[model samples]
Target chain A: LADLFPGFGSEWINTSSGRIFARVGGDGPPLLLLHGFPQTHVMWHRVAPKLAERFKVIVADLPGYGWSDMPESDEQHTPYTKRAMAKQLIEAMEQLGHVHFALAGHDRGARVSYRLALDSPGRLSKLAVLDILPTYEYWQRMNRAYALKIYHWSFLAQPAPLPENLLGGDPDFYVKAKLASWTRAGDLSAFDPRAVEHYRIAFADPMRRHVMCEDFRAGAYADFEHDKIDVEAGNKIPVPMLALWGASGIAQTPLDVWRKWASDVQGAPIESGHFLPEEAPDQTAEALVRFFSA
Target chain B: LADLFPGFGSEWINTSSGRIFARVGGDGPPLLLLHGFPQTHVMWHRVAPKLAERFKVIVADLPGYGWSDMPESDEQHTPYTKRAMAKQLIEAMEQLGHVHFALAGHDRGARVSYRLALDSPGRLSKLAVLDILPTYEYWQRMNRAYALKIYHWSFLAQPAPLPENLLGGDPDFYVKAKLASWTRAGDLSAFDPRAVEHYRIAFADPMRRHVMCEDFRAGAYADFEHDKIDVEAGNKIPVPMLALWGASGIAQSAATPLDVWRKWASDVQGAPIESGHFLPEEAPDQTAEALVRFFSA
Candidate 1:
């Protein structure tokens, strides 16, 4: 994994939830990259080094995802939520000697990025969310078609042990199926076998499977309430935000949805799928560099 | 299964889709009884014999359910749609030498009865639906509350083998959970152990799991569209309709059930039985008396 991230140094910092794992590389303004569900920092292998050329890159595995500690399960799923995960990342970032840093994240990590921007106003210099809408909006907009497209949202959020039991029954198949279906190619062509192996290994663990479900559970409950409260309070993202989505991804309209959540927002579609960083690395990197540099 | 349906004669009839198994008994005007998901014709075991005292009864397994053959899978899930199942039941009734009958159905069977009333008007002398609203109403009225209550609607309706694999992995647990959750008691105490065995065995068969999903897929797709078209066209059931639901059942309201049915049916009447989704099983005497009174009328 380190070989894929050459010229990078590994770091692990103790956080409230558990120990946080990250890879630090390059030398410039600090920039943190967070990965999403069923994935790890390895998802940034294709894009991070390029972004590193202009900025110091910190690629992290979101807590309870890949190569990260599994926090204790709670009824509210607070331990696996975007708010909790973001707080941990903030502490980890501060320990690495950066108080305020530019942050970009994909999938679940993208969720944490926005939550962080909302929760701690001055902690992030810039924010980039890859291929997602805010948690509240996604639930509000769900109709039959959209529900069918992302059935896993409800399935994984179901009460404890149901999803865990089913997923753990055949973790490899479940992991591979999600990776294949969410891609524009509708297959594994876009993902590296090694990255997939990492994903397969993570889901195959019973505890990780439980926490991943908890991640979605949080998205459905506490995280959704937080976003709803912020929206009702007229709170908005205070940072310059970049919203990038796969041209053929699950999110309906990235830019249109983001504008309502943030005041200073701009984004474009990449010619890839849900895993935009891995699927469209060059375009994703180019867009990130331009937005963060500005 | 046979012991539960004592004094009832079992028959298997072939239709275009496949073979449908039913229990025939009594000696009066024919009344067909169709059962719902995860259970077979045996669901009517508690109520059927009593109703049989007044009206000839046909307790049937809907295609792809217990003791019935699973028809070949198709892209539209047409093989398991209410329209197709109704047609098969209608054919079976005609073959039994009854051109017309009073009909009663619970759950998926209720879906078939209403479809039959619409598609083959005058074929049913009267109609009774247990513990359900029309397919369109359920989907149209879905909010987070309703969606969570009936998550299996979406889960089972997912395209193909995904649901099959997950459910088949633990068929017994899935069957018992569905049974336990939907009842007012929220336990298997309302259900006979023997009847539960029938449900468990059916789901244990891999093909039945596939077909059960196809059943929900049909509900989401063709059945929904069928009801939508009828509502738009102002097509109503030509016969008298009775809407009975459990007091604590999945359906929202029973007199309200009658009120909604009255839109598609001019002569609609009903009330709630003090039970759960398995109205017949939980409140057997009440369920039978209501059906007998309606059909006898």
Candidate 2:
């Protein structure tokens, strides 16, 4: 993972909530990058360095993912909710002497991105979310097609040890299948073998698997309620927001959905799969740079 | 399991589709009873005998369930679909020399019951469905509450080996939890230890576990498609239908059982028994009274 981010400084930083593993590189305006589910900060292996040339990029794995400390989640799954994760990330950034920054999050990271931007409006100058809609939108619009595509949301959220025990049977195969299937190419060609090793390692641990489920449990429960409250209260993202989703990805009508939640939102479909950072890194980086530079 | 049935004759009969395990007893108007998931024909143990006193009772395990042969299912999951299961049971009934009979099915058996009535409208003198709605209705009405309540529909329907593998981890606990949870009493007290032993025996087999997944795979794909086709074509069940559900059962969370069934059948009437999903076992006397009254009519 370090080889991919040559010249980058890696450190494990302590946040008020938990410890976060981050890679910092380049020297310009502070731009915080958060990685998504089933993968870590390593997802930015191809995109971060390019953005690094123009921006001070700080890529960190969200709490309970990658090398980040897996904090004990409560019955409410408070520790795994994007709000909780965002608070920890914010503290991590503050500790690093960067109080506010441009933020881009993909997948679960994207979930935390909008959440952070909403909770602390002034913290983000610009926010870009990749391959996801509001957690509330997903649940509100859940139907047959969406349910089939996102079955894992419900499957993972099933009460503990059921999903844990199932995935524990063949954790390696499960992660590989997920990464391979979500890509446009429908194979592992898009993923770096080294990066996949990181993902596999995290998934292989029984606790990490449980944490992953807790993360999704938060999505369905705590995260969902939070999104719902925001939606109802008209608490939209005050920062300029850019929504980029894969052309054939998990999110539907990315710009349309984001527009309802953010004031200044603009986005287009990236011709890739769910993992835009890894699948179409150059384009993803270009979009982020163009959006954040302004 | 046989001890619970008293003098009932237990035998395995071959159908065009596959082999069937059935218990035959009593003497009167033929009333075929079908059992649901995670259990077998033995679920009827509490009610079948009482109904048997008034009507000739034929309780059989649906294919891939307790004591039934695990027929080879196709990519389309044809063998486990309600249509396929219904066809085999009909053939089994014919072999037993019953041309037309009153039918009552619980859970998956109720699924087979409705499919059987639609395909062979003239074959069933009357139809009673215990605690269920049509397969298509379930998919159409899926929401957060319904999905959670009926998570097994999707969980079991997940492509083979995943559900099979997960279930095989602790099959006994899985079946016991299901039975215990889906009942109003919320414990195993409502169930006979002997009958639960039969269900545990079936679930303990890896092949049976795989077959159970196949059964739900059919429910989602083949059975869902069949119900959809019938719904679209306005092919309603052309027979008197009686829908009996647990007052606090799985179906209660969805649309009214009679309302949903009435869309698929014209002459329909139903009432909820004060029980859970295991209506037969939880409220056996009331279940028998309903069956006897409906069939005796």
Candidate 3:
């Protein structure tokens, strides 16, 4: 992953919340980028260098995923909750002496970043979420198409070792399956082989297998309950949140979805699949720079 | 299947719409029984005989399923619409020498019976739908749990041959899969081996494969629109409607989800039982007892 970001070196931060692995580069207003599932902070390797030129960029892995410390999971999978994950990122940013910063994340990380905006409305200047509907909206709008697209949401959220046991023998195979299937042509030809190798290494660990399931179990039950509470309380994101989306995937108009959840929302389409950070790195970097710089 | 419903005579009813295969042998008030997906009129084989002792029980397969005629589908799957199926049953009932009658159906059949009650309210004395919420209500209140449990509602509802061509290759495999999965223990043992064979034979037909897809295509798309219009127009079923749910599978969010039905009909009542999707077969005595009391009174 370092090969993708040649000049940036890594920084490991440990706080009361947990330990987090991150990389920092550039010199301007702080902007934090968080990575999603089955991958590490490497997800931002494509766009982080470009953004680093305009703003100080910090790419961090969520707690219990990638090279970060794997926190223990409880009954509701509360420990792995996005609220908890978002706190870890905020604490990591504060440890680096950047108390308040612009934030963005993809997939699972995107889930965390939004929670941070909700959890600390005054701290964030602008927020960007990639290719996702609000968790509450997802439950309300779930149809056959969405269910087919994200069957893993149900499969992974099933109780403990059930999901872990299934992926225990070949977690790499499961990773490759998701990588290929979510793309337009339904193949991993678009992915850099080394990045794929990086993902394989993290998922191959038996401990990370359990972490993966707890991540979604938290998403399904715990994180979802948090979202419902926020939504019912009319806790819209007060910051200028941008919902960037891949051009071709499950959702056709993610901007409309975000507008309903965030007070000052804006978005535009990028030419890519679900993984726009890698698939359309140049377009993504341009969009984030344009949105954050403003 | 015959072992379950002995002494009932099978009759082939040819009507203005299509041919319908039905079994009849009962005495007092007339009661029409309709069966749901994968299974046929035989689904009532477990309870129809018991009901026969009191009412004139008539168990018939929906159009294009079981031994019924398989019609060609329109773009909207109109021919398979509950409106059309309800029309066929009404015509069949008239030919079978019954004017006004009590009606009951399970699953797909339940969907048709409710529509029948709404279409020509005067014709149906009482309505009973087993193991289902109103199709309109299902789409309106759809959640992750219901979506996961009944993904077929959308899969089968997609444009014509998309679902047909996919399942037609080995439709019997799907039959067993549906049978084994939707039960309490998640096993096929709940189904009679012969009854399972009857479903397999009907599903084995490549044409029946397309027919099954059209069934839900109508439910998801066409029937849904009709339901929406009726709901918006404030048109409710005038007959007394009954909803009996199975213990497991889906549709058990609240203790009694019967109020969902009460909204659509003037008189509606139902409760869940210790059974599965095939409630008639799973709890034959309870199903029969409910119908006998509801239809008789």
- The estimated TM-scores of all candidates read 0.96, 0.95, 0.69
What's the lDDT for residue B194 in model 2?
A: 93
By DockQ thresholds, what CAPRI class is model 2? acceptable
Clash totals, every prediction: 0, 0, 0
User: Candidate 3 on B1-297: residue-level lDDT in tens?
Assistant: 344578888888987778999888888899999998888888888787779889998889899999888778788787789999999888899998888999998888888988888788889888888888777888775567666456667656655444555465456666887887788887888878889988998888878878888888888777888888888898888888778898784555433567777778777888778888888888888888988888876
Task: Check candidate 3 and list the clashing pairs.
Answer: none
Give the winner by DockQ: 2 or 3: 2
Best by lDDT: 2
Highest TM-score, which number?
1
Quote the lDDT for B134 in model 1. Answer: 90
Lowest lDDT block of 10, candidate 1 chain B: B141-150
Candidate 2 residue lDDT tens string, A122-144: 89888999999999998887665
**In candidate 2, what are the lDDT values of residues B215-289, reduced to their tens digit?**
888887889899999999998998898999998998878688888888999999899999989999899999989
Shares of reference contacts reproduced by the candidates, in order, are 0.11, 0.16, 0.19
In model 2, the Cα lDDT at residue A227 comes to 88
Ranking by TM-score: 1, 2, 3
Chain A, model 2: TM: 0.98
Interface RMSD (Å), every candidate? 1.8, 2.2, 7.9
